[PDB]
Design a binder for this molecule. Sequence first.
Ligand SMILES: Nc1ncnc2c1ncn2[C@@H]1O[C@H](COP(=O)(O)OP(=O)(O)OP(=O)(O)O)[C@@H](O)[C@H]1O
Ligand SMILES: [Mn+2]
Ligand SMILES: [Mn+2]
Length: 277
Amino acid sequence: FYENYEPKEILGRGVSSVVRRCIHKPTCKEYAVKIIDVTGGGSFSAEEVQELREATLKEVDILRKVSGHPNIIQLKDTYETNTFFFLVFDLMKKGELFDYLTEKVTLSEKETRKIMRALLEVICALHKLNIVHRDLKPENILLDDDMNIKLTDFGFSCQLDPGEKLREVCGTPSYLAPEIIECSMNDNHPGYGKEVDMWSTGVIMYTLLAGSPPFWHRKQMLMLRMIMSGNYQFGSPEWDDYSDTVKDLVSRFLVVQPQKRYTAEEALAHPFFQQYV
Ligand SMILES: Nc1ncnc2c1ncn2[C@@H]1O[C@H](COP(=O)(O)OP(=O)(O)OP(=O)(O)O)[C@@H](O)[C@H]1O
Ligand SMILES: [Mn+2]
Ligand SMILES: [Mn+2]
């Protein structure tokens, strides 16, 4: 990696990796490199290190499969050694949607419609290929020069065989679909699928508008109970200025029963996105 790229400053860090800005020596163009330390540390037992190696490979695999979409991050180069993985992506200058939301506090309904439209189009493309992202959140949505969205972080992503379900619990609890929490509680649960992305997308859209999570609590225990029950509300002091149309959309995502939750294709067909037909 270091023979072709000059490593710069840290752009981010993950549980087992570091993301740094870097310069491609030959071209002198800048990129971002996600460096994954497969060996990690203590909890990284003989078996764990391999758990990561295989996961990274899946990540790269998905990346390669979705390469080419205007709003998905583009994997440009990869390198591997007996310890680290080096994924090279185009550099996202305006950073994370999370950072942006941090400054803006909340976003307008028109801006949110801009972002949501692009996001749904991405998820629609991922779902069309039977790929579940499993980590849809503001932190994994980056921004380019023109403030256009770029979905990143396919570290928990999986391309599913027809009818294949998942059972592992991974991702930020606040964005976890009820099915994921259910599954962890009971082994006799049918596992989960793509629909989890749609719940996450719901949490996201809500937070963009409200500047806060639909579900939250001091104790994770009750927070999860809230998610499971789907007990969230359009807070009286915030949601006043937004149209009911957006509130109908948000509510169609936050549906505890996967089978009755909106799909990306349905979401995009909702009134909220039909002004110029
Ligand atoms: N192409 C990019 N351009 C700009 N900076 C980026 C890029 N990709 C990642 N970063 C930054 O690094 C952070 C981590 O990237 P990424 O989400 O892939 O890491 P991770 O270790 O998988 O994350 P997590 O801890 O959520 O699992 C991002 O949130 C972002 O701030
Ligand atoms: Mn991430
Ligand atoms: Mn990740």
